[PDB]
Design a protein around this ligand. Structure first.
Ligand SMILES: [Cl-]
Ligand SMILES: [Cl-]
Lengths: 145, 23, 150, 22
């Protein structure tokens, strides 16, 4: 396989496991350490977003995956428009996907959200991740310690 | 789309605050 | 005529004093809507700074008013070095003055019950000298600032 | 140094705050 394939699949796994955690549905059997720190850090960001941006989020009625996709795309475009990447920003990608998944559930969402989250992370930050020590080294060292 | 600029700004702020909190 | 800039400075200084009094919970002798808005938005920023930039704030010690003034000017000079001004940046001037004042209260060697008055002075000077014209050109505190954040 | 990093973050915070209130 290619480095691109392995990177995307790893990102997708991370997205999936985070969103499963947001849905509070158990999964059968090997949480990596990157999964565990992402769970902690992304969920705390997600709670902060849901509190700080409550007035914006209550304005959205996410009645379809398409609406969720567009909201995600537009917000992410603004967030990353300055061309800067860091681990905090990568965490917020996961967190905002979880915010939108929760809203969808109330207003397979899991499959589709994990996919568009993974694609955005790969396409906009995949090379940066590679260059900054990857998930099981750079990422965990950043948020531990 | 005003919301995209405004939410995107706040998320960037949150992100970069998190980045700085961990050095 | 001969008083426009004097009035502007005194108004800026009043806002700075009332913000710093709010930070330390010191009852003011004289609040306007501009003060209320500034107190909300700037205090939000101050808490954000104290929470997220702790590791950098821990890198210095504010043992005197002289040190506070130097640190304030250094940080502010860096923030505004790109020559850009907006209301968000003006908010951060007040907010960082508050951050430093809190540090000074904890770290100052000499007894100084008046510390907040001295900090309000150098905060006001910075605002006037670097953003005073921009403030006048951008609606002032009522038509500009309040409308921005309300 | 710490002065340049704090100034840089304050600038980021300020500009994000500014952009939030269009
Ligand atoms: Cl996959
Ligand atoms: Cl502005």
């Amino acid at each position: 396989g290619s480095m691109a394939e392995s990177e995307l699949m790893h990102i997708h796994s991370l997205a999936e496991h985070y969103l499963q955690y947001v849905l509070q549905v158990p999964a059968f059997e090997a949480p990596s350490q990157a999964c565990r720190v992402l769970q902690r850090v992304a969920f705390s960001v997600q709670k902060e977003v849901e509190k700080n941006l409550k007035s914006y989020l209550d304005d959205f009625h996410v009645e379809s995956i398409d609406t969720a996709r567009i909201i995600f795309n537009q917000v992410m475009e603004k967030e990353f428009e300055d061309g800067i990447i860091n681990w905090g920003r990568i965490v917020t990608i996961f967190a905002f996907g979880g915010v939108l998944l929760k809203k969808l559930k109330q207003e397979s969402a899991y499959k589709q959200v994990s996919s568009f989250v993974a694609e955005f992370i790969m396409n906009n930050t995949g090379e940066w991740i590679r260059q900054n020590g990857g998930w099981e080294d750079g990422f965990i060292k950043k948020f531990e310690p | 789309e005003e919301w995209a600029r405004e939410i995107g700004a706040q998320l960037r702020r949150i992100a970069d605050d998190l980045n700085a909190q961990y050095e």
